[PDB]
Amino acid sequence: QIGPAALKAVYDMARKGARDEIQTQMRDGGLFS
Amino acid sequence: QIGPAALKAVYDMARKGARDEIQTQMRDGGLFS
Amino acid sequence: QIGPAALKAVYDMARKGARDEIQTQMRDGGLFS
Amino acid sequence: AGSFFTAGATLAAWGAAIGAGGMTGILFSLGASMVLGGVAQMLAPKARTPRIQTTD
Amino acid sequence: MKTFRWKVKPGMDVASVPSVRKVRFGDGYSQRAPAGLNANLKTYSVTLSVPREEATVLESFLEEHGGWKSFLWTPPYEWRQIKVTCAKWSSRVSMLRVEFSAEFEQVVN
Amino acid sequence: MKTFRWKVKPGMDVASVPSVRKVRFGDGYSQRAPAGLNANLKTYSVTLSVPREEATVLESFLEEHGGWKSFLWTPPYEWRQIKVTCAKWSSRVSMLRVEFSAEFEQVVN
Amino acid sequence: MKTFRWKVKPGMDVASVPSVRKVRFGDGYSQRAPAGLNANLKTYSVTLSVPREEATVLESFLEEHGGWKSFLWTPPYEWRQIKVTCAKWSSRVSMLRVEFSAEFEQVVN
Amino acid sequence: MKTFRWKVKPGMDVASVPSVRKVRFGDGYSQRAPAGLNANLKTYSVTLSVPREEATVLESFLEEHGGWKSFLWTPPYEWRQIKVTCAKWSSRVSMLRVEFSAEFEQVVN
């Protein structure tokens, strides 16, 4: 795996994970992000 | 490395990083997440 | 790629992505994080 | 917090096998995450209070 | 059946790589601890060569255990009976003989 | 079509690698389970050599199933007919013959 | 021009690896579906040997198409005219001859 | 300095690999475009052998341009002068001769 192309994929997967975690925290217990 | 398991591991690591960043921003300066 | 060194890089990229997503959601529509 | 002990176990045998379908990685022990608000928060839900109003 | 009674070819590898607790930051002071109690359980890269007729019997033995269910075995290395487990045991079926490449990892339970 | 009639010359690779559930405890102890309910499936690394005129028939047979679908085959290893699927079947052309390399995977279905 | 009219060397690889839909969790019950309608479009690893003078014509032909613009070709494998596309076509320019290494992946449109 | 005068002995690699825009639709259909506007640039895997006294001149010539900048060269492949850039030029010294292995990349500039 070449680093330059993999870094963008890792960044975008991180963005997706952050969005999913934010939406999860807006639930009842959570943290309300 | 094989792409499937690597992508899953990256997703869980991203979720953990997002949770840590959210809990960090709830401190004094931060952004209050 | 040795896993021990790559995991820290993935964690830091995840932290950066989480911060970017949080700052993005504080815009007009968003979720206000 | 720093890749100081990711190489402490060296992760070599797991990394060379990326994981498995039988077993999962990245367990991320919830020790310090569940204790951030306090030990009393892990046992009780910390009842809330209304916002202070200047009209009062 | 609980005993591997077949014979292995001359060239067999034995890997040990024991499990220890290592603490060393950068290239400074280092500390080492024996970690667990059963430190090294070794690993034998066993190879066999058997006529085509006994290949079925050998694979029946290895298949019945099926990864779990360790069996007794006396390696020609230290001549002490141990308990081992196999998980791959690939095979190659030539015109008159078949060769088995298996990995025996020693266990305790 | 249902049955594979061609024959494998050189000595194939028959890989078992059963799936097990393994837990590694602390000082040398462990816990193992067979994970699944019906054995392991086992796969054959098969290679045919055929005249250039018959390679078209073999290609048609291997392409009709097309990755999915299963056909009967009696491996020259245990002589028990099994259901297999082929998914790659690379083929190399020569002056008068064609050499097929393929991976047959046994399937319950 | 729309037809590849050169001759290929004896050794040529033909890979198929068709496209199927596979559903299988762990090592349990598995289901396979044919996926698309044009299942496998194969791939031919073509090698050519041409004098240094005609290498210019061969590269002009392969370069005018330029990755897109599939062209007609009759492989010496099944003798049926198909439409193929090339994307690499590396070359080695020896003292008197040149060797072309190209990949022809067949298409539909 | 503009022109490359040294000569390539053994037979070089002339790689084209054009860039195309490819979309794969469902049941075997696709959509292809040439992506760019001016062809593919093509690269040469060049290798020189020179007397030990002339290697200094070759290295001075290859270092003056220093990765960037372009020089004229007429490849012994199509005999059309092109502008190229070299960025690695590994060199191996011996008793009486020095062997250079370099990668010349054609540039519009």
Place this chain on the structure above:
Amino acid sequence: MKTFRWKVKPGMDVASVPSVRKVRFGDGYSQRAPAGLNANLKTYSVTLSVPREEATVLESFLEEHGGWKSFLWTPPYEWRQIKVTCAKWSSRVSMLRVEFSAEFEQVVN
């Protein structure tokens, strides 16, 4: 047990790899520091050949220390006794002899 008495036949590999702190500035300048305080430790890629009866003794010696712990050894390189640790010691069995391969890492401790 403290001292290693067996002898190394073939010609080992003695790798130093000092650890330094290096900063690369802009137009060709840099800044280097020795990072640590006490030299570099160096590691030896050692191989033994032993009769099939003494292999058990060698294994017992290398297993008593078990990855951690250090033993004295005078390498046939500088003839200065040093403290070393071994952590892998792979071994290949043969008809009349056993060939050990190991990595001895020098330790201050």
Place this chain on the structure above:
Amino acid sequence: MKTFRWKVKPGMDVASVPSVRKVRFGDGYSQRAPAGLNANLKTYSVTLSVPREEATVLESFLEEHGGWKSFLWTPPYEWRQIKVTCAKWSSRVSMLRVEFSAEFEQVVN
């Protein structure tokens, strides 16, 4: 001590790979700039063969510098004295001679 005064074996590699600033999006227009002032600082894969007695002296010289502390050296390539740094310098100790494999990267400061 500040001058590597030993002799290197015939076959040694000299890699240059200069540092340039490249801007090119996709396969469109490209712009190249010389980047820094000391563009290419090369790298010499030096190999030595020395009797077992002088191996200690050579290793002491290489270890005292220890990664940092560049030293003066005249490569047999351009015969111009430069300042170089070594970082690995592995060694292999045969029955009568020892070979050194070192990497010399030249510096400015």
